[PDB]
Every structure is written in structure tokens, then in C-alpha cells.
Amino acid sequence: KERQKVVEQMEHEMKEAAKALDFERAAELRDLLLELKA
Amino acid sequence: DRFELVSKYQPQGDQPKAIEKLVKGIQEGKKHQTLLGATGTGKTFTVSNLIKEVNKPTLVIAHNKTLAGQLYSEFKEFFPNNAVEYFVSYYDYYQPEAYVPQTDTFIEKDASINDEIDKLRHSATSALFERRDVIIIASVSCIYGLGSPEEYREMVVSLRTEMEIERNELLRKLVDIQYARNDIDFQRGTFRVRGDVVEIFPASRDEHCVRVEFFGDEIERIREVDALTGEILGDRDHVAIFPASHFVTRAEKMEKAIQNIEKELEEQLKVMHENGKLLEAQRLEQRTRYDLEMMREMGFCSGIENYSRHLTLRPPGSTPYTLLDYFPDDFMIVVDESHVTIPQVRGMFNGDQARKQVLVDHGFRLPSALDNRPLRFEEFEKHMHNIVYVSATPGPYEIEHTDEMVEQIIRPTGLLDPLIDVRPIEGQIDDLIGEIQARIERNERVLVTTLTKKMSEDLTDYLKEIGIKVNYLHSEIKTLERIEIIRDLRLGKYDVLVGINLLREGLDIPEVSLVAILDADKEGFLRSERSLIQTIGRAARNAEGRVIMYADKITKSMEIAINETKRRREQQERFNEEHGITPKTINKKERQKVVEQMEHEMKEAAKALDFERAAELRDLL
Ligand SMILES: Nc1ncnc2c1ncn2[C@@H]1O[C@H](COP(=O)(O)OP(=O)(O)O)[C@@H](O)[C@H]1O
């Protein structure tokens, strides 16, 4: 659950950056997320 | 089985006293209590604390699914080691079956089921049978029909290591409780078999399954495994597999129910022919006998829920089994935003009954379809063991049934109830422009409530003509679009929102320093004591929050609202002084169509996580 907790938290934060129009942060987060899924 | 409350917080302000009183109230076996918390006092933290201390399974009822999701996220963080669950309608969208006599047009049931929501529903009901440390955040879906909890409990397949049992006998039991063999696409509600290994994907999970390993007619091991990976997560000596459906109708009962439906039909047809309801008799008989062929063939037909009461073999008028029945007798209900949620709970049966009687009158449904219904409010009352209503403005139900209010008026960071000014109706708009302009210079936002569509559109248009950034919160804007507009207010894409009703979900935002109330003295619904105090509340999230009410006179509702606001602010400033606290905020037509298309595009690119394309579009915009 702890890994999944951080992943699930990172996603929230990515969608939130995106809603602020902070697409630069959102992309930084997306890329980190993809590395962790791999 | 204790609740373990996890938070970065400690009770502050008058939270300790509110918690003390509410706990003592349950110890005194008080059936009804009300937490009178002013907005922004941390009522949800207060309830967390109550839940921990009383230590009963608890049902939290919320009036819209946005707020229910919002409570659920927060309670999962609060109780990471206890079972926090989510119980809402599984319909992604729902058009109920309806008939419009005026236009002689029937509306077919239209709806799509959300797989994740059905999962969370199953997770909720199975938890009530697995442990005591359960908190469920629910909509009024909690008063709607579910199978018998006794049967659901009874239909559980219990497995334990070293247990004797044949592999194929397990398969048979799983089918009998609505699991489906699927070796190829192994999803929830599904089992797959590989030789001596069965993997059951519980209906309550989409993440982990149960791997059951046989040696001959004996289970050797039970493991929670990651369904996709096969990565073992842990061994189990015991597992309960609950039915994959909340309404399972075994073949024996279905045959009998079809007997009874036919007889009911036979009697209704008699009565309608006597009253010369010829059209309605023809319609009813076509429909029902078709539904009945399908049940005989498939053990299923669309809209089968209309037959729920028959499929149970229970007598007419019987109270549905609801989630309320899955809970132990000794459970607690917390009613969030009770002044809204209580009338909603009462309103469900009557809305349901009205809609369904026009269907029975016109021969679309048998009378028994009315037994497929939510609870009556008198039935919901029967489930109240201890109930705690939560509201800044309790309704007349709560007020009547509560001996003494528990008040909570102190905000964590000492934020005050706003200053109120009453100013004449004459010079209204101009006075307001001035106050808005001043807020713009200060990088603060404004909410404004008008009584009408007409004034809201006129003022919005005038503001726009002036160079002010504004959005009209039209009444037919859904909460999803509402939240987008509010996000944009927070960002400063808009500086002002104009709406008739500002009490719509999600309008508490820290950047708002002024709330203006036009026509404060016109009473009605919009200017009642309740609407006034809630509207005042929108300005209490900011350390310089202020309300202006335009009015030629002080109505009864203005008096109670203004009085209560001024009284709280006084005690709040006393607390602050006495505790050394300083209040601190917590935190052209062608152009128009082009912008709306690029925005949709920007939003689509964001869902797709093509954040680079969404940036390109923002910069374009
Ligand atoms: N004891 C506490 N200490 C610090 N912050 C708190 C405490 N209780 C609540 N809060 C936070 O203070 C803010 C105000 O609470 P909020 O939940 O908006 O109140 P309400 O539910 O009454 O509208 C929220 O951010 C909330 O999470």
C-alpha cells in the first residue's frame, strides 16, 4: 500500500498542477510516474 | 477493533469542548444531537474525533457525490488502518423510466454503470461483515434497495487452509453466488482456474485477488496476490468470499416469483378492463408477459429491479432491505449538511412514488413496482440509534429532536466571522462597482448574489463592458463545470462570480474578501435566515472578509443572521486575544467561440497527459 499511496498521491498532484495550468509541473510529474510504473 | 485517528492536527479552538459534549451525549444514549459548527471550524475533524472516541461502525450521509467523494478522501487519510468505504449509486448517468401524459411519450431507463463505484459498494457491504472499524461515506443511495443482509452474509463462501473441499465444488459455489468463469479476461467478479489453482477476483476488489491452491480435495494455501503480476502479497488462514451481486435470485425462487407476477398481472388486467382502461391493459400485458418470457429463458430481463419485491417472495408494502440493514443495531449516523440532507432523504420516496404511479396508472408497470423503492422517512427514523446532524444552520427536524445544540465557533487559525454593512438599495450597483474595483486592486475576489436571472445577467454584462473579469454562475451549470469556473476564480481568470444561489457546492474559497448580497431584505428562500448565514459564511475564509447587504429595511431573517454573525465574531476575537492568536487566511463573439474550442482542446490534452500540447494551447489562449 505504501508505494501505491505515493503513486496515487503523485497523480492527484499532477491533475492539480494541470488544473492550475501549471503544465510544466504536471509534465515533470508524469515523467517521474512513468519511470516508477516501469 | 479500535479506530486509529491519523492527522497532522490536534484539537484546537472549541473543538475539544464540542467533542467532549458529543461523546457524552452518546454516553447518555441521546438519539439525536446536532453539531452547530460555523463554516470553517473543522467540523469534519470534530467528527473524526467523535468517531474514534465512541468506536462504533459509522455511516456518514452526504447530499451530493462531490462532497461524499471529498469526505471519503479525507476519512481515508484520517483512518488509514480502519475500513473507510464509499457507497454511492453506481450509475455514471441515470435517466429513470418515466412517462409524460401531456405528450404521451415514454422515457426508457437510460444509464451506464461505473465499474469502480460497484466495486466500492461491494467493498462497503462486505466490510460490515468482516470487521467493526468501518466508516462509510454514502449518498441517499444508503436508503435504496439491497438484498437481504442475512442472505448476503449467509451466502458467503468461507475458505480456510487445511480445509477439505473439492476444486469443482468450489467452482459450483462461486457460480451460485454470481461469479463467472473467465480464464482469458480475469476481472473482478470473475474466477480463473489453472489446474490445482483457483484465482477468485472479489467483487470488492480491482487490484488483488485470492489464489486458492489445492492438493486433491484440500486447500493448501490461500494468498492475496496482485492479479496482473502474480506477485504474492500475503498468506491467509481464512478468507470469506462474498456474493458478486447484492441481489441474487436462485432458480427456485425465480420460478415461484414468476408464478406470483402472473397472478398479480391477471388481477390487474381484470380491474383495468372493468374500468375500461383498454389501452393501458394491452400495454401492461404485452410488457409484463415479455418480461416474463425473458426471466424464464435467461433468469434476467432489463429493468428487472421493478420485480425486486416479487423476487424476494415478500408481501406487498414490505420495507426494502437497505445498507442501513447491513450495519449492526448499535451504529452511528453522521448527517453532513443536515439542513439539506434531511429534506433530501425524505424527498426520495415521494419523488420515486410519484414517478412510478404515473407508470402504473398508464399500464407501463405493475403495482408491485412501487415496492422497488427507497425508504420512507419513518422507516429511516427506525434505523436511528445515535444520529448527529452537522450544520451551520440546522433545519426544523434537527432543531425539534435535539435537546441542546453543541456549538463550535472557533477557527484553527483564528479566522473571524465577517464584518457586515447594510447599505441602501439606491445607488446599489454603483456602490458595488466601487467595492469590486477596490478588491481588484488588492488581488482579492468577490462573490455576488442577485435574486434573479435578469439582474445577474444585467450586472454580469455591465461588469464585462467595464473591463472587469466575471462569470455568471447560471443555474443550469452542473457542479463539474461549476468547479472549473471556481478554480478559474481562485486563479484570478475571473475576479467576480455573480449567481442567484451561492450555496451551490464548492463556493468556500480563501481568495474571496467580499460577498455582496443584493436585495437582502426580500426574504423568500434566497434571503431566509439559513441562506443569509450560509452566504455570509463564504466571506469567512479570508482574514479581511466582509459582507455588504443592500436593503431598505431589516427583515426578520436579516436580524437573526446579522445578530448571530456579530455574536460569533465577538467570542472569536475574545478567544484570539486571550490566546495570543492573529487571524490568518488558510491557503468579440468570434473571439468567444475560438476560446471555447481551444479550451476544450487544452482540457482534452490535459486528460491525455499531453501537458506540452495543453501548454501550447494555454499560451495560444
Ligand atoms: N485542529 C485543527 N488544526 C489545524 N487545522 C484544522 C483543525 N481542524 C480542521 N482544520 C483545517 O482547517 C480548515 C477549516 O476547516 P473546514 O473543514 O473547512 O471546516 P468546515 O468543515 O466546518 O467547513 C480546513 O483546512 C481543515 O482541514
UniProtKB/Swiss-Prot annotation, chain B:
SMART domains: DEXDc, HELICc. It comes from the Bacteria. It is found in: Cytoplasm. Residues 24-411 form the Helicase ATP-binding domain. Transmembrane segments: none annotated. One of its GO terms (molecular function) is ATP binding. Belongs to the UvrB family. HAMAP family: UvrB. Forms a heterotetramer with UvrA during the search for lesions. Interacts with UvrC in an incision complex. The UvrABC repair system catalyzes the recognition and processing of DNA lesions. A damage recognition complex composed of 2 UvrA and 2 UvrB subunits scans DNA for abnormalities. Upon binding of the UvrA(2)B(2) complex to a putative damaged site, the DNA wraps around one UvrB monomer. DNA wrap is dependent on ATP binding by UvrB and probably causes local melting of the DNA helix, facilitating insertion of UvrB beta-hairpin between the DNA strands. Then UvrB probes one DNA strand for the presence of a lesion. This is UvrABC system protein B. It comes from Bacillus subtilis (strain 168). The lineage of its organism: Bacteria, Bacillati, Bacillota, Bacilli, Bacillales. The gene is uvrB.
